[PDB]
RNA sequence: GAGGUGAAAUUCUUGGAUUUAUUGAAGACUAACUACUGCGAAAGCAUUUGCCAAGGACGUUUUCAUUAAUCAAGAACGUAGGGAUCGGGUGGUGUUUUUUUAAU
RNA sequence: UUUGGACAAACUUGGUCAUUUAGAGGAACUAAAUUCCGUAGGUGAACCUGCGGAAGGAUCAUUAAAGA
């Protein structure tokens, strides 16, 4: 018997977010960023920064009790890159390694229908 | 970030150290409607069941976007995730109902290619209940067998005919049904084959899908009807011993 | 909402209400003659301050009285003379008001980024801002110091120097940083403002600094006196003979030409005189020694 | 996605090589004639400018009709991406050759 | 902590910034389909549905009988050959289609 | 109205002591190895903000068969 969170891995520019939520979407669990692990302000979008960020999220979520994670990668959307950078795959590799069962990898990046 | 960066006049406001909320949170599990199989879809944190913004009414608004392969156990539709609105909380089990449906975007982004034209349709239709749906439909031109030309384009006066007949027949398929019946006839993907059978006369029409059902107005609660969609239940005694 | 005062092991003495949450600095006189002080100067996040009076003992006394003729947000600092207190804050507002009808007497703006603290001694004003320098007022612009980043708080040390905090380290005044902390600091406390304590605090760690290493210049004078003593006795031994302790002083001072001459004379004595290759005292004297000067 | 199979094996072994992707359409909005100029300018002649960026910044790129992909190490991805976005803004290839000589000097 | 860059910085943020979810409002635009394809006198023109007129090609054993062209002034708007494709028509004769509801 | 009053923050003149001065001498000692036009804006021209435009700027892999 396993229970499921939802990753919502944000592969932004100049930053990376990982925060697993229970699969409604309200009760977020352990928001981390790329900034709050590294100390340089130059590579707060580092793949290594996202790696240990996802490691700390995996530790806190195993502490709470969720074992599998439906993972959803979101790029910055809008009229911008529309496609995950390197930090998304870095966090994905990290929390796929770190003892956490992974389900239903997707892409929830917004598409504009030709906005401004 | 670190120690050498900045204080930035926002860290002077002090931190309000620890609340440890996961010792206070509470686990519920979700029961899907009985049109599907495997109605247990997972668990949800809420809050502690106290008064003054209680749990049973801080609940009952949310949605859960579960996958149809996770509901049916069959990987023939790994796409087409649905959204269940949690509606009636009843004894640790969130009884939910249907709220929407959408394709995972990789499926349609791999379906659409060039050298074919795609058709869209969408109607606002009331069911036999008082739900109203902006139900959608996507369609694609089939490269006919024994073809030679690279094109396979629709004449754009066939497009009005295909869109008219597809809006007419799925308007009929909604209006002759209730919402539970609409889910139980949308799950084994049968209005797609109905569109292809009633529309292969005019054009060859590669794979048809519906890809979106958006609810826009809900009738009422009808607690008894929602309990009828799952199974009955009567919460009764536990021993006092004091 | 509040700001309260505690008197007597302690206990509550007087609550004080009426603000927007009072998230700010307080201040007391440094002149108290009777058995109770009479000026509580608090600031607020109403962009205002409030002076009031702490009344007589043997009560509870939750009151609110005197004006808010003010900015209308941190770092309130009181005088030993209690004629002028300081309220420097909030993007280069270095104002000083008069513990009375509070006029706008000599407001200053010579900084670049937001202010962080202001302090001034019992013994003549020093503020500290986000310009990573600390500046000294009298009037106008006496001095500044400057280091790495974001000087949080400063304090005068006993007449004329001052110690500043929170670059990553408690630095005195340039000369003499003290860098035993890791993260940010909001703490600087002295005993009698020139004497043997100053306590500072990081997020977690306490650093108690005893300021009792100014006998180190005394023992450094003792070191130089020792050096000239067993340097001149080397010349005395070279001129008087008894080459053994002359060798000892020459080796401990590493004077190589006098070393060469002292053991040349020792060697000539050993060739002239009559297991043993120098005089035997010098033999055991180089026998005993340790490794580094060996 | 479009790299060759030895390049994908190079992603399989030595796990710290990631794969960035972006589009032509994000910068300067690139109407179709200028888009043809853009992909012809990035490919050069007989793939020579693309192979120059490949051998210079220790990474390997592939490019579809409007969306390109670079795989390698992360700061080499960033170096190749800034050289590509300068070239797609439109620069003399001699100037981007000199810039890549400087970036190869940073590489050594 | 967020932003932002080659690094920064400004700014925002414990009155909860970024992110997450449920909505609601506002204007603009019509992602992929998109091509050496379509239209319009030209500039230009891409969501659906309806109305209002117009236009082009084709079809034609229908009518009129030189009504044509060319432009100042003025006016409105701003050398021969072959393959493939789009629109229309004719013929062929296989699969898609289907049959007493209409259509083609 | 002060019956009447020690004092009382700041000042005047001198002294008393100290701080740096600021540079100018004197005379001692120690040390001394990508381009351009039109519409609009301002920077002195250029150049630049934003829009419509012509590249006279140099296309490599990938392409309709799949037999569970």
UniProtKB/Swiss-Prot annotation, chain A:
It comes from the Eukaryota. The keyword Acetylation applies. Keywords: Acetylation, Cytoplasm, Nucleus, Ribonucleoprotein, Ribosomal protein, Ribosome biogenesis, rRNA processing. GO terms for cellular component: 90S preribosome; cytosol; cytosolic small ribosomal subunit; nucleolus; nucleoplasm; small-subunit processome. The keyword ATP-binding does not apply. It is found in: Cytoplasm; Nucleus, Nucleolus. N-terminally acetylated by acetyltransferase NatA. One of its GO terms (molecular function) is structural constituent of ribosome. Belongs to the universal ribosomal protein uS11 family. Present with 29600 molecules/cell in log phase SD medium. Component of the small ribosomal subunit (SSU). Mature yeast ribosomes consist of a small (40S) and a large (60S) subunit. The 40S small subunit contains 1 molecule of ribosomal RNA (18S rRNA) and 33 different proteins (encoded by 57 genes). The large 60S subunit contains 3 rRNA molecules (25S, 5.8S and 5S rRNA) and 46 different proteins (encoded by 81 genes). uS11 interacts with eS1 forming part of the mRNA exit tunnel. uS11 interacts with snoRNA U3. uS11 interacts with MPP10. Component of the ribosomal small subunit (SSU) processome composed of at least 40 protein subunits and snoRNA U3. Component of the ribosome, a large ribonucleoprotein complex responsible for the synthesis of proteins in the cell. The small ribosomal subunit (SSU) binds messenger RNAs (mRNAs) and translates the encoded message by selecting cognate aminoacyl-transfer RNA (tRNA) molecules. The large subunit (LSU) contains the ribosomal catalytic site termed the peptidyl transferase center (PTC), which catalyzes the formation of peptide bonds, thereby polymerizing the amino acids delivered by tRNAs into a polypeptide chain. This is Small ribosomal subunit protein uS11A. The chain holds residues 11 to 126 of 137 of the full protein.
UniProtKB/Swiss-Prot annotation, chain B:
Residues 1-16 have a biased composition (Basic residues). Its main location: cytoplasm. PROSITE patterns: RIBOSOMAL_S3AE (PS01191). The keyword Nucleus does not apply. Keywords: Acetylation, Cytoplasm, Isopeptide bond, Phosphoprotein, Ribonucleoprotein, Ribosomal protein, Ubl conjugation. It is found in: Cytoplasm. N-terminally acetylated by acetyltransferase NatA. GO terms for cellular component: 90S preribosome; cytosol; cytosolic small ribosomal subunit. GO terms for biological process: cytoplasmic translation; maturation of SSU-rRNA from tricistronic rRNA transcript (SSU-rRNA, 5.8S rRNA, LSU-rRNA). Belongs to the eukaryotic ribosomal protein eS1 family. Present with 92400 molecules/cell in log phase SD medium. Component of the ribosome, a large ribonucleoprotein complex responsible for the synthesis of proteins in the cell. The small ribosomal subunit (SSU) binds messenger RNAs (mRNAs) and translates the encoded message by selecting cognate aminoacyl-transfer RNA (tRNA) molecules. The large subunit (LSU) contains the ribosomal catalytic site termed the peptidyl transferase center (PTC), which catalyzes the formation of peptide bonds, thereby polymerizing the amino acids delivered by tRNAs into a polypeptide chain. This is Small ribosomal subunit protein eS1A. It comes from Saccharomyces cerevisiae (strain ATCC 204508 / S288c) (Baker's yeast).
Swiss-Prot record, chain C:
It comes from Saccharomyces cerevisiae (strain ATCC 204508 / S288c) (Baker's yeast). WD repeats lie at residues 18-62, 73-107, 110-145, 146-179, 181-219, 229-270. Interacts with snoRNA U3. Interacts with MPP10. Component of the ribosomal small subunit (SSU) processome composed of at least 40 protein subunits and snoRNA U3. The gene is UTP13. Present with 8070 molecules/cell in log phase SD medium. Involved in nucleolar processing of pre-18S ribosomal RNA. The lineage of its organism: Eukaryota, Fungi, Dikarya, Ascomycota, Saccharomycotina. This is U3 small nucleolar RNA-associated protein 13. It comes from the Eukaryota. It is found in: Nucleus, Nucleolus. Signal peptide: none annotated.
């Amino acid at each position: 018997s396993q229970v499921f969170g939802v990753a919502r891995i944000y592969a932004s520019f100049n930053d990376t977010f990982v925060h697993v939520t229970d699969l409604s979407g309200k009760e977020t669990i352990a928001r981390v960023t790329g900034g709050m692990k590294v100390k340089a302000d130059r590579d707060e979008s580092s793949p290594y920064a996202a790696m240990l960020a996802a490691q700390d999220v995996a530790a806190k979520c195993k502490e709470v009790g969720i074992t599998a994670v439906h993972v959803k990668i979101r790029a910055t959307g809008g009229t911008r890159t529309k496609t995950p950078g390197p930090g998304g795959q870095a966090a994905l590799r990290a929390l796929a390694r770190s003892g956490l069962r992974i389900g239903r990898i997707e892409d929830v990046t917004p598409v504009p229908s030709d906005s401004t | 970030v670190g120690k050498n960066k900045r204080l930035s006049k926002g860290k002077k406001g002090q931190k309000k150290r620890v609340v440890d909320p996961f010792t206070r949170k509470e686990w519920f599990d979700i029961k899907a409607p009985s049109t599907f199989e495997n109605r247990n879809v997972g668990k949800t944190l809420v809050n502690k069941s106290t008064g003054l913004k209680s749990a049973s009414d801080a609940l009952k608004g949310r949605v859960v976007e579960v996958c149809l392969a996770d509901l049916q156990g069959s990987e023939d539709h790994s796409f087409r995730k649905i959204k269940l609105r949690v509606d009636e909380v009843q004894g640790k089990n969130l009884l939910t109902n249907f709220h929407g449906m959408d394709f995972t975007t990789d499926k349609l982004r791999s379906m659409v290619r060039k050298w074919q034209t795609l058709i869209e349709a969408n109607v606002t239709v009331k069911t036999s209940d008082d739900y109203v749906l902006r139900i959608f439909a996507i369609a694609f031109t089939r490269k006919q067998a024994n073809q030679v030309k690279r094109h396979s384009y629709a004449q754009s006066s066939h497009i009005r005919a295909i869109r008219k007949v597809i809006s007419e027949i799925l308007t009929k398929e909604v209006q002759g049904s209730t919402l539970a019946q609409l889910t139980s006839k949308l799950i084994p993907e049968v209005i797609n084959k109905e569109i292809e059978n009633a529309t292969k006369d005019i054009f060859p029409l590669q794979n048809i899908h519906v890809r979106k059902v958006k609810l826009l107005k809900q009738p009422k609660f009808d607690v008894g009807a929602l309990m009828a969609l799952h199974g009955e239940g009567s919460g009764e005694e536990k021993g006092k011993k004091v | 909402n509040t700001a309260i005062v505690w008197r007597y092991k302690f206990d509550i003495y007087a609550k004080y209400i009426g603000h927007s949450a009072a998230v700010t600095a307080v201040g007391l006189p440094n002149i108290v003659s009777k058995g109770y002080p009479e000026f509580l100067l608090t600031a607020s996040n109403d962009l205002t301050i409030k002076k009031w009076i702490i009344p007589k003992p043997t009560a509870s006394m939750d009151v609110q009285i005197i004006k808010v003729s003010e900015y209308t947000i941190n770092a309130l600092s009181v005088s030993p003379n209690d004629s002028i207190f300081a309220t420097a804050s909030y993007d280069k507002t270095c104002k000083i008001w008069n513990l009375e009808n509070g006029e706008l007497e000599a407001t200053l703006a010579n900084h670049k980024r937001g202010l962080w603290d202001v302090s001034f001694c019992q013994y003549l004003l020093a503020t500290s801002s986000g310009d990573k320098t600390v500046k000294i007022w009298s009037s106008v612009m006496k001095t500044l110091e400057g280091h790495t980043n974001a000087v949080q708080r400063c304090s005068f040390i006993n007449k004329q120097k001052q110690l500043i905090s929170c670059g990553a380290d408690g630095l005195i005044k340039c000369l003499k940083t003290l860098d035993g902390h890791n993260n940010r600091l909001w703490a600087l406390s002295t005993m009698n403002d020139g004497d043997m304590i100053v306590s500072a605090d990081a997020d977690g760690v306490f650093q108690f600094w005893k300021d009792c290493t100014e006998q180190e210049i005394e023992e450094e004078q003792e070191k130089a006196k020792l050096q000239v003593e067993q340097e001149q006795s080397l010349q005395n031994y070279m001129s008087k003979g008894d080459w053994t302790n002359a060798f000892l002083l020459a080796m401990t001072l590493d004077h190589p030409m006098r070393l060469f001459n002292v053991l040349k004379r020792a060697l000539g004595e050993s060739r002239s005189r009559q297991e043993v290759i120098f005089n035997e005292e010098l033999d055991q004297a180089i026998s005993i020694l340790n490794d580094e000067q060996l | 996605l479009g790299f060759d199979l030895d390049d994908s094996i190079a992603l399989l072994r030595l796990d710290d090589l990631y794969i960035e992707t972006f589009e032509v359409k994000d910068v300067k909005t690139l109407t179709g004639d200028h888009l043809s100029r853009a992909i012809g300018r990035i490919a050069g002649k007989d793939g020579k400018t693309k192979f120059a960026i490949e051998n210079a910044t220790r990474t390997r790129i592939v490019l579809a009709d409007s969306k390109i992909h670079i795989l390698g190490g992360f700061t080499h991805i960033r170096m190749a991406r800034e050289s590509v976005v300068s070239l797609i803004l439109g620069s003399p290839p001699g100037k981007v050759y000199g810039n890549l000589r400087t970036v190869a000097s940073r590489l050594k």
